[PDB]
């Protein structure tokens, strides 16, 4: 029976491949060739944030485009005021091996975790004025690689056990498990309407998940190695991924096909992080060469670079409004560009 | 009237920065160690004689050591291995001797040592269960490592009294198998410190201490162009 089920799976895979070929009338590169290029982009560092001692693994912008949360390997989260560069909080962690963090859209909570397989949720707004742990979420058996906030009572996490999960923060119980990956899950991204999310994994694939049903709606392939970063397009009908093969790819959720490849002969390093600008025209990615390249998302041309790091770039993000891009690296510094 | 809020933020930084300075001193004086080993490794004994991650703290001669043991993580090491790229040392425990467990250990060590992020991290290597190797050999290596048939005891070998020369050859053969990998790939940035220990031995606590010292000393000697 096993050989026949395998043959059936191969037949379905071939049917899917032909179904996708049937829609491949033209590539993106044959349409946007009539669009003027963005030209040279020269961003400059405006502010530098100092205080972490260990390599910084995660950074996330809040919804007011004014506060940042960052996490280093020391066991400390720092809340920063990007405008005045002043610190707001410095939260000690139970363990130093923190790999991800997230800022709640309400500004009330901060989530983080990593090798302890526990997602810790801190309440930043308490009557005593002291930051306290409000919840510890546990169930995941592998390391925690990414956390995202849907609402104050709902959080989406991913772990190294190939399973994503939706947690009910107030009750502390896991409510939805998303399975089907075979490698570690590296990065999550939520849809603008937070009904769908996409999960990239160390399988050279990504999956489009239905937040409400618990069903995996689409599976995307195309990368040659492990996927390290994923980011939804501003419109919500496409996402960009980065992998260890030194290529970045844009996928279309409505055509279930790869749409564009971003690569260069001189780039042989993986892509630690991927992010889009407010208009979706610029794609930014951090590399292992201690820099960041800004790509024209509609042309696959390089628009410019962000150089100012001496160690691996670990994270990148853009403000909701679009006024600034912030990055972090293993140098224990955060920088803001303009 | 907005100056009152700005003043308040300055006060917060003063409180935070002073605490960070205190914490920074504690951070630099603490030596972090990563503990890895074979599935049959006596890793528990390694801990006793000294979730997804466990922490053990030691104070050895007024020096604070922090050892992290990998808990219930997936067998795929290539992603969390990068995180431990700034520890003082990696302690790798291999049991000598059903698959060819030694080849797996040698396979793993080769992969670790040549990792692009671990090029400056030294490895302290413990070879455990010496009595099982000794009994197996005196009671086979050539069926797994044919070159052992032509191996001779190093001229600088210092075996304990009472050891069977066949056992001493097996121990040095295995040690040399690890050392050839370390020597061939190393470029003076990090070193391997192999040791031959017993399953139960409290002396291991000083072996790590002394090795950590030498690692740091040679690091500084490299910096000052003396070594």
């Amino acid at each position, epitope marked *: 029976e096993l050989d026949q089920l*395998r043959q059936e799976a191969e037949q379905l895979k071939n049917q899917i491949r032909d179904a996708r070929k049937a829609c491949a009338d033209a590539t993106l590169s044959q349409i946007t060739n009539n669009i003027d290029p963005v030209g040279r982009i020269q961003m400059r560092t405006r502010r530098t944030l100092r205080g972490h001692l260990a390599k910084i693994y995660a950074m996330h912008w809040g919804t007011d485009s004014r506060l940042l949360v960052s996490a280093s390997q020391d066991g400390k989260l720092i809340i920063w005021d990007s405008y005045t560069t002043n610190k707001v909080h410095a939260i000690p962690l139970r363990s130093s091996w923190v790999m991800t963090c997230a800022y709640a859209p309400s500004g009330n909570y901060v989530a983080c975790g990593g090798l302890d397989n526990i997602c810790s949720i801190y309440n930043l707004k308490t009557r005593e004025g002291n930051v306290r742990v409000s919840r510890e979420l546990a169930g995941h058996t592998g390391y925690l690689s990414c956390c995202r906030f849907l609402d104050d009572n709902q959080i989406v996490t991913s772990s190294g056990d190939t399973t994503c999960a939706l947690w009910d923060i107030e009750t502390g119980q896991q409510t939805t498990t998303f399975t089907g990956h*075979t*490698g570690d899950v590296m990065s999550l991204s939520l849809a603008p309407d937070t009904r769908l999310f996409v999960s990239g994994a*160390c*399988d*050279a*694939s990504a999956k489009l998940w239905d937040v409400r049903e618990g069903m995996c709606r689409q599976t995307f*392939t*195309g990368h*040659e*190695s*492990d996927i390290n970063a994923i980011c939804f397009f501003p419109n919500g009908n496409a996402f960009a991924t980065g992998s*260890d*093969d*030194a290529t970045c790819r844009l996928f279309d959720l409505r055509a279930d096909q790869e749409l564009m490849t971003y690569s260069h002969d001189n780039i*042989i390093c*993986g892509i630690t992080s991927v992010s889009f600008s407010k208009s979706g025209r610029l794609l930014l990615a951090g590399y292992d060469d201690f820099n960041c390249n800004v790509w024209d998302a509609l042309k696959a041309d390089r628009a410019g670079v962000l150089a100012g790091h001496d160690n691996r770039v670990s994270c990148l993000g853009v403000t909701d409004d679009g006024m600034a891009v912030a990055t972090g690296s293993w140098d224990s510094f955060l920088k803001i560009w303009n | 009237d907005q100056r009152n809020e700005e003043k308040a933020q300055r006060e917060a930084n003063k409180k935070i920065e002073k605490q960070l300075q205190k914490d920074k001193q504690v951070y630099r004086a603490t030596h972090r160690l990563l503990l890895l080993g074979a599935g049959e490794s006596g890793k528990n004994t390694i801990v006793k004689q000294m979730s997804g991650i466990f922490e053990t703290k030691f104070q050895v001669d007024k020096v604070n050591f922090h050892m992290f043991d990998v808990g219930a993580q*997936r*067998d*795929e*090491r*290539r992603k969390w291995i990068q995180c431990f790229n700034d520890v003082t040392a990696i302690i790798f425990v291999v049991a000598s001797s*059903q*698959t*060819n467990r030694l*080849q*797996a250990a040698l*396979k*793993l060590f080769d*992969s*670790i040592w*040549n*990792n*692009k992020w671990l090029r400056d991290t030294s490895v302290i290597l413990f070879l455990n269960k010496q009595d099982l190797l000794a009994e197996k050999v005196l009671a086979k290596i050539e*069926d*797994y*490592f*044919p*070159e052992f048939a032509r191996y001779t005891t190093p001229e600088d070998a210092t075996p304990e009294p009472g050891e069977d020369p066949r056992v001493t050859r097996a121990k040095y053969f295995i040690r040399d198998e690890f050392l050839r990998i370390s020597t061939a790939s190393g470029d003076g940035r990090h070193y391997c410190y192999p040791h031959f220990t017993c399953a139960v031995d409290t002396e291991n606590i000083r072996r790590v201490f002394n090795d950590c010292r030498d690692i740091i000393q040679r690091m500084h000697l490299r910096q000052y162009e003396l070594l």
Partner: nanobody
Framework: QVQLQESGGGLVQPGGSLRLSCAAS????????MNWVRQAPGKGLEWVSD????????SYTGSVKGRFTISRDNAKNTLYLQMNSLKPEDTAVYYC?????????????????????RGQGTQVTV
């Protein structure tokens, strides 16, 4: 999507030989190190051979030295294995496996848990 499909298996008598193959797709073959691993009927996966991207450096487990050889052809994306002087001890399912990243020399591909860049394997009964 990347695939590895083994071939050239079968049953042979002691002292005989086989030539195994492995077709790769979905990635640039010449940029990756390739390995052969075996699954023993009652034992966990064991590494057998490791060939570098250029074919300049080939490593074998000690138990197969002088009996097994490997090669690759980057113009065909094909990895081979010559299995000579076989003994009952060599009965196993053989898998062709790829190192997780290009342009590197560190590999973790004999994991018990489902490995993403491993083929289905071919049974070599002796």
């Amino acid at each position: 999507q990347v695939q590895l499909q083994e071939s050239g298996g079968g049953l042979v008598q002691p002292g005989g030989s086989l030539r195994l193959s492995c077709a790769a797709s979905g990635f640039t073959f010449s940029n990756y190190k390739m390995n052969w691993v075996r699954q023993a009927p009652g034992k966990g996966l064991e590494w057998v051979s490791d060939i570098s991207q250029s074919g300049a450096s080939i490593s074998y487990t000690g138990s197969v030295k002088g009996r097994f050889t490997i090669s690759r052809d980057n113009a065909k994306n094909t990895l081979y294995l010559q299995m000579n002087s076989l003994k009952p001890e060599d009965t196993a399912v053989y898998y062709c496996a790829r190192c997780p990243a290009p342009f590197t020399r560190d590999c973790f591909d004999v994991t018990s848990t489902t490995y993403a860049y491993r083929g289905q394997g071919t049974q070599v009964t002796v």
